[PDB]
Amino acid sequence: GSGEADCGLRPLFEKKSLEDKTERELLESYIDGR
Amino acid sequence: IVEGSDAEIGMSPWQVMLFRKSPQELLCGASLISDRWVLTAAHCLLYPPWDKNFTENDLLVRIGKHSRTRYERNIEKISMLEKIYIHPRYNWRENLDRDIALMKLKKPVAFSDYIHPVCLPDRETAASLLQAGYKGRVTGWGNLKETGQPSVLQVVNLPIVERPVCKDSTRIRITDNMFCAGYKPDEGKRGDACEGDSGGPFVMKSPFNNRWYQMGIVSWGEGCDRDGKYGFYTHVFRLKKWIQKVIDQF
Ligand SMILES: N=C(N)c1ccc(CNC(=O)[C@@H]2C=CCN2C(=O)[C@@H](CC2CCCCC2)NCC(=O)O)cn1
């Protein structure tokens, strides 16, 4: 939509359900902790 | 980047290096937002106090990189600039307000495992993700300390800081078009962007659709990773309309 389709989905990670070493540190902060 | 660590392969496929033709050196960071457009900080191109004022032909855009100095044959893609657009109201004279610029590539770049565009935030996404305490990611090949350089692309995860706290850390006049990020003195952890990271992307991964969005652009700071001070970034969404305006017309 407000951004071309497919954008933001990394070939070597999201597209293969693979996580990078520290992305969970980010998602864990989108709640209340840090 | 100070106190960060080596990024892994294909971790930031939108990461762009602004390379100078002569001499040949790292100039700034930038980001790929489509097959023909790259985003960066205006002070990277224009900054009179330092007689800095580059044009289309003084620069090269290098996409898909990991190593700072090597020419990554078969992996990276070097592209030329067709046109540069600085924000008409970029304030280099006072506080670097509206530190943003768009660059039009001469020819579309072909995506791959190492080259892929990041997403631009929309009102909803920015509203939900841009909050104090939430962490974003900054990447670059800039300095490792205030006063050498990394061998490989560096990455750091930093929390966004409360606007009031940003205002009381500097004598510089803050504006709505910027936000600051970093750890406070008593938070144990540290880290920050630094000279050479300018124009680099500050991104966040949406918990809703799993996509990575670019919320900021490495803009300025006073020193690097000093206690009590924070890094400032251009508020990408606040300037989103200037962006679409430019892309839809040019
Ligand atoms: N620690 C950080 N987060 C950081 C440090 C430096 C840079 C590169 N950006 C700059 O160098 C810009 C370009 C014009 C000057 N500038 C600054 O950051 C000035 C502050 C400017 C604030 C706006 C008005 C002009 C001075 N400080 C340099 C320093 O102390 O190391 C980016 N981030």
Side-chain angles (χ1 to χ4, degrees):
Chain A
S2 186
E4 98 121 304
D6 209 17
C7 67
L9 264 18
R10 297 171 301 176
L12 290 187
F13 293 92
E14 286 83 21
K15 290 185 174 178
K16 307 202 306 179
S17 292
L18 259 50
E19 273 176 44
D20 66 49
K21 310 174 185 59
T22 61
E23 71 179 77
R24 191 177 308 88
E25 193 204 336
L26 275 42
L27 292 303
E28 294 199 323
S29 74
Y30 303 154
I31 316 176
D32 49 55
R34 194 181 301 183
Chain B
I1 294 293
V2 180
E3 286 293 70
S5 54
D6 296 359
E8 40 197 318
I9 308 294
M11 182 194 237
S12 313
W14 39 72
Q15 182 62 47
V16 173
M17 173 180 276
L18 231 56
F19 211 71
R20 188 181 184 177
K21 287 178 180 173
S22 184
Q24 286 179 58
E25 3 135 63
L26 165 62
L27 205 81
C28 270
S31 73
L32 187 65
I33 58 184
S34 86
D35 60 48
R36 258 255 190 172
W37 297 84
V38 298
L39 191 62
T40 191
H43 78 261
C44 284
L45 306 166
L46 220 193
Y47 194 54
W50 299 345
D51 293 299
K52 182 109 82 64
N53 179 183
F54 299 115
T55 70
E56 287 65 29
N57 297 85
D58 293 288
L59 292 157
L60 273 195
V61 161
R62 302 177 67 183
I63 317 169
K65 297 195 54 62
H66 180 57
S67 180
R68 187 194 98 220
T69 58
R70 329 303 190 199
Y71 169 62
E72 316 192 73
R73 188 161 50 93
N74 279 183
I75 296 187
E76 68 169 88
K77 225 113 294 286
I78 307 188
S79 180
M80 302 185 296
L81 303 174
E82 172 173 297
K83 228 292 180 289
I84 289 186
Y85 303 82
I86 310 292
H87 191 294
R89 304 180 71 187
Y90 156 54
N91 204 330
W92 49 268
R93 286 174 178 290
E94 170 187 355
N95 59 354
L96 244 28
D97 186 23
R98 299 197 182 75
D99 189 7
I100 189 170
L102 283 172
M103 300 184 283
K104 163 69 95 63
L105 271 42
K106 267 198 168 62
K107 205 191 319 300
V109 120
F111 304 149
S112 74
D113 283 355
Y114 320 94
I115 296 178
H116 200 76
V118 66
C119 300
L120 254 39
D122 53 3
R123 175 167 279 294
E124 301 56 270
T125 297
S128 45
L129 286 329
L130 211 41
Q131 317 191 73
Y134 283 25
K135 286 173 177 174
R137 182 173 281 174
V138 188
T139 50
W141 291 282
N143 294 7
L144 295 169
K145 40 192 178 188
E146 203 178 309
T147 189
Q149 286 200 295
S151 176
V152 106
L153 175 72
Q154 298 293 297
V155 64
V156 219
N157 292 155
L158 294 168
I160 290 171
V161 174
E162 303 79 359
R163 186 165 289 282
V165 182
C166 300
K167 198 178 177 300
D168 294 333
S169 65
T170 178
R171 290 218 236 179
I172 294 300
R173 187 174 71 77
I174 304 314
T175 78
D176 285 336
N177 306 133
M178 43 178 88
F179 67 81
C180 86
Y183 289 104
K184 307 183 200 310
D186 76 67
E187 278 182 312
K189 315 175 57 177
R190 59 193 310 106
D192 187 14
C194 195
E195 177 171 10
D197 292 329
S198 290
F202 175 99
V203 304
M204 290 173 88
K205 177 163 186 164
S206 177
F208 309 114
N209 66 21
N210 273 242
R211 285 166 192 271
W212 289 88
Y213 285 93
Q214 185 182 346
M215 308 311 292
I217 299 178
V218 176
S219 183
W220 62 275
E222 304 171 301
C224 296
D225 194 43
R226 286 186 189 172
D227 306 79
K229 317 296 283 194
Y230 308 87
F232 289 70
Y233 306 71
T234 301
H235 196 305
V236 178
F237 183 67
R238 284 280 197 283
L239 298 164
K240 176 61 164 308
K241 293 179 183 54
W242 171 71
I243 292 169
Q244 294 174 175
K245 187 179 305 164
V246 172
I247 296 173
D248 295 323
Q249 308 310 291
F250 300 113

